């Protein structure tokens, strides 16, 4: 049946296989007519040099412009022949190439895919075309303020590290960019073991690995500095002013990463548009709906390899900024001391739900593996996560937050019309309570 | 585990159930009441009603309710369209009973407290606004007016003089007017039938009254052009399509994948769509065209929604429209259709494979049929489409009253008379 305890038990397990040249193989059988076929690569900007900045990004567009065996636009005209959707995306710490398809024609898929991974048509026809679009887009990118401030955010904490740099990289490089340097980075980091392969669907493990089928896969990092600081772009014309505030935290692999998953879930989030009103349990969603001290906000977590990011992102009236803050320091600080096991539970349940929730669907299932592999390896400790949940304690959360919050140096990002936002020296004194 | 179990009642309300093994345990509740069921003085009610969700039941204080779902970790959802409003809820495998019980109290036990009703007046706009970020959003709503007179022309949103207009009572009737155990349909997912089967008949048997079908929507075309400040003018051309649940509805559902391009590849301008290609070739710098097909119970519409720049729109329309002619003239490619069939079958299954989506697909059949059809049968029926069908299907869109909606800078914007 479906019973939460038993519900953990029966799942198609993590599968693993390993080829010779460093390629990884892995899978899970969902008993489904379709398969998400995907690839994840750990080559980052944090690898990329100061010219390489944004190049792999530029590269990202290029694969589908045609390849070695398949010149321009002969690539997709086979793809859509099957009717199988196709997509690719990249990230500072990862890049994921993947396919969503019926399990039938997969024998082509990976072979199609394998061609793309390395064999590529590097043709300055596409280059200039793509060189333009990016440049076109580079300027357009000022339209979504969200992404904008984060760029500021990293650079202010991680200054002096390749991690602190634009994903697309600065503009002039893209013009200056030449496809030989690509071929470098093409050759550099697209080797295995850097490469990793997974999939999920009706696919069985060995019927994956057999048709993982002989093609090829392949043949530097530093701990980053953390900057107590501030950045402000003051532009007063705009109606609203985003805010972001955070402190650094543990990397991907680390015990406490889960212990802090809940504190966010507990403190929760608010938005203009909820039907929750003023009776919600989250003090923030109660007040921020009550006096509409903000339009909305949400809290984030991002844990890098060695690093982690805890903080929120809010939007409030140009006269309402201060009061959002003096509230927001309330919640974190009060947790570190006076918190209680009751509210723990309501946080505990949610994260269980959110965990179980995201686990439906081919691609997301497929998608965990790749990062997880590049992160914890094969580990998909599904039922364990539950056991992991049972670990967390009142002291734990307090003792955890005591570390990473009380009397620390926070980072401050801002975007105009900021001006109200108090000076740092307030925020700093505002981190540690005086016992009030 | 166990496959689809759907059960007629004496009330006729289908209680459909499956058994899962998953700890995710969800339930959903469908209702026939859409915007078409609002009257001239009843306007926006459902849209307002759709914000009646969180309010004070007759079974409990809304406070307790709201603090209830969170501390449990469950989640509530509400959804409507021009036709079928749907009340969705989910939580862990174990605790559904507490939650499930509250699903009733809301739909079972209404209370409209004149004070509690007032605070929701401010809310509509801020909701109503954010939907109109997307220009296409505003464009669509206008369209149902142009092509109809009465029913589907009804907005999903509140015309603004209608704002202060709505009393608890007006709601209160439409509550019980359009509610009946004949129309109500309940769907389980992860929970055994008998538990589902138990409480279903218990509370949910009320009347009667039902269902006010006097809206045939009376397709009546026309065109509407709003003068606006966008650089990218938006427009669409529609000759009425057929009713839902028909090979024609499939034929157009096939006919779309002919021209209709959703990207199957990121950033890829879809070449297999002749539409964009046959356009983009004779055409110039950025634009987009996609084919729009949608059907409701009694009927639906087929069209294509264009996005172009100031001068281009007409030729953007015209060529594409002229390109439509090409198809209507006896142009055919069986493999393309075949590939399109492959697209559709996949696209269908890829659509359906999603449980939550399929969760709808369950009751989307129910209020429509009340039975279940394996997608295999669909996939079979997908095959059943003849080409001359899709041939003459497009011919219809050419062969019949067509309608336009346009908004932006209109200086160069042609009418349908230019067409």
């Amino acid at each position: 049946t479906a019973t939460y305890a038993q519900a953990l038990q029966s799942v198609p397990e993590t599968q693993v296989s390993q080829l010779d040249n460093g390629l990884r193989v892995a899978s899970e059988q969902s008993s489904q007519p379709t398969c998400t076929v995907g690839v994840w690569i750990d080559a980052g900007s944090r690898y990329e040099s100061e010219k390489n900045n944004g190049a792999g990004y530029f590269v990202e567009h290029l694969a589908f412009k045609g390849t070695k065996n398949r010149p321009g636009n002969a690539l997709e005209k086979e793809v859509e022949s099957m009717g199988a959707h196709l997509n690719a995306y990249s990230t500072r710490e990862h890049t994921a190439y993947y396919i969503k398809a019926l399990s039938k024609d997969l024998p082509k898929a990976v072979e199609l895919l394998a061609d793309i991974v390395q064999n590529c048509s590097l043709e300055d026809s596409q280059i200039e075309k793509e060189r333009d679009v990016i440049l076109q887009e580079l300027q357009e990118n000022d339209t979504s303020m969200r992404d904008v401030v984060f760029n500021y955010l990293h650079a202010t904490a991680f200054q002096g590290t390749p991690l602190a740099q634009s994903v697309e990289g600065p503009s002039e490089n893209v013009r200056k960019l030449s496809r030989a340097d690509l071929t470098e980075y093409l050759s550099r980091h697209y080797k295995a073991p850097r490469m990793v392969l997974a999939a999920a669907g009706g696919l069985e493990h060995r019927q994956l690995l057999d048709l993982a089928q002989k093609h090829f896969s392949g043949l530097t990092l530093s701990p980053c500095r953390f900057t107590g600081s501030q950045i402000c772009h003051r532009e007063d014309g705009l109606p609203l002013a985003h805010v972001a505030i955070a402190v650094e935290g543990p990397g991907w692999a680390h015990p406490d990463n889960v212990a802090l998953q809940v504190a966010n879930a507990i403190i929760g989030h608010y938005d203009c548009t909820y039907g929750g009103g003023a009776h919600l349990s989250s003090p923030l969603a109660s007040i921020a709906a009550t006096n509409k001290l903000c339009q909305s906000f949400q809290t984030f977590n991002i844990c890098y390899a060695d690093t982690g990011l805890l903080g929120a992102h809010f939007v409030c009236d140009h006269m309402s900024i201060d009061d959002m803050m003096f509230v927001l320091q309330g919640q974190w600080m009060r947790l570190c001391t006076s918190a209680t096991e009751s509210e723990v539970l309501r946080g505990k349940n949610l994260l269980r739900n959110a965990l179980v929730s995201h686990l439906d669907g081919t691609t997301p299932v497929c998608e965990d593996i790749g990062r997880s592999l590049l992160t914890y390896g094969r580990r998909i400790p599904l039922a364990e996560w539950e056991s992991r949940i049972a670990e967390v304690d009142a002291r734990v959360v307090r003792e955890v937050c005591s570390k990473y919050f009380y009397d620390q140096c926070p980072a401050v990002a801002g975007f105009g019309p900021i001006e109200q936002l108090p000076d740092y020296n307030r925020i700093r004194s505002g981190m540690f309570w005086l016992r009030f | 585990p166990q496959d689809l179990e759907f059960t007629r009642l004496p009330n006729g309300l289908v209680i459909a159930s499956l058994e899962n093994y998953a700890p995710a345990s969800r339930i959903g509740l469908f209702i026939k009441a859409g915007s078409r069921y609002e009257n001239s003085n009843n306007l926006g009610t459902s849209h307002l009603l759709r914000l009646a969700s969180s309010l004070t039941t007759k079974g409990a204080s809304s406070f307790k309710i709201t603090r209830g779902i969170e501390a449990v970790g469950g989640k509530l959802s509400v959804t409507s369209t021009r036709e079928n409003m749907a009340y969705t809820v989910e939580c862990l495998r174990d605790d559904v009973d507490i939650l499930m019980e509250f699903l009733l109290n809301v739909t079972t036990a209404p209370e409209f407290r004149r004070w509690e009703v007032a605070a929701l007046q401010p809310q509509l706009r801020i909701d109503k606004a954010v939907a109109l970020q997307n220009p296409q959003a505003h464009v669509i709503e206008n369209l149902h007016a142009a092509a109809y007179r009465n029913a589907l022309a009804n907005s999903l949103y509140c015309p603004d003089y209608r704002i202060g207009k709505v009393t608890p009572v007006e709601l209160h009737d439409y509550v019980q007017n359009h509610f009946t155990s004949a129309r109500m349909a309940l769907i389980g997912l992860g929970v055994s039938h008998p538990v589902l089967k138990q409480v279903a008949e218990q509370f949910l048997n009320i009347r009667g009254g039902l269902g006010l079908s006097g809206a045939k929507a009376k397709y009546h075309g026309g065109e509407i052009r709003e003068q606006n400040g966008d650089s990218l003018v938006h427009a669409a051309l529609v000759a009425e399509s057929a009713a839902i649940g028909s090979a024609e509805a499939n034929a157009f559902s096939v006919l779309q994948h002919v021209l209709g391009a959703g990207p199957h590849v990121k950033r890829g301008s879809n070449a297999t769509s002749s539409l964009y290609q046959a356009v983009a070739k004779g055409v110039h710098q950025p634009f987009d065209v996609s084919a729009f097909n949608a059907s409701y119970s009694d009927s639906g519409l087929f069209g294509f929604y264009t996005i172009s720049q100031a001068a281009s729109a007409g030729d953007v329309i015209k060529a594409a429209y002229n390109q439509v002619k090409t198809i209507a003239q006896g142009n055919l490619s069986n493999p393309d259709v075949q590939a399109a069939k492959n697209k559709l079958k996949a696209g269908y299954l890829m659509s359906v494979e999603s449980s939550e989506g399929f969760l709808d697909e369950v009751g989307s059949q129910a209020l429509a049929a009340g039975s279940y059809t394996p997608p295999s049968t669909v996939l079979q029926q997908i095959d059943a489409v003849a080409d001359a069908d899709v041939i003459n299907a497009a011919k219809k869109f050419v062969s019949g009253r067509k309608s336009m909606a346009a908004s932006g800078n209109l200086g160069h914007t042609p009418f349908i008379d230019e067409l």
Partner: peptide, 22 residues
């Protein structure tokens, strides 16, 4: 022309902001 997944549009309000559709 977007139905694009499905027939016409959508609206949803519960908590988390909202959703549109085609």
């Amino acid at each position: 022309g977007q139905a694009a997944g499905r027939p016409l549009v959508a609206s949803v309000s519960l908590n988390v902001p909202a959703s549109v559709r085609y």
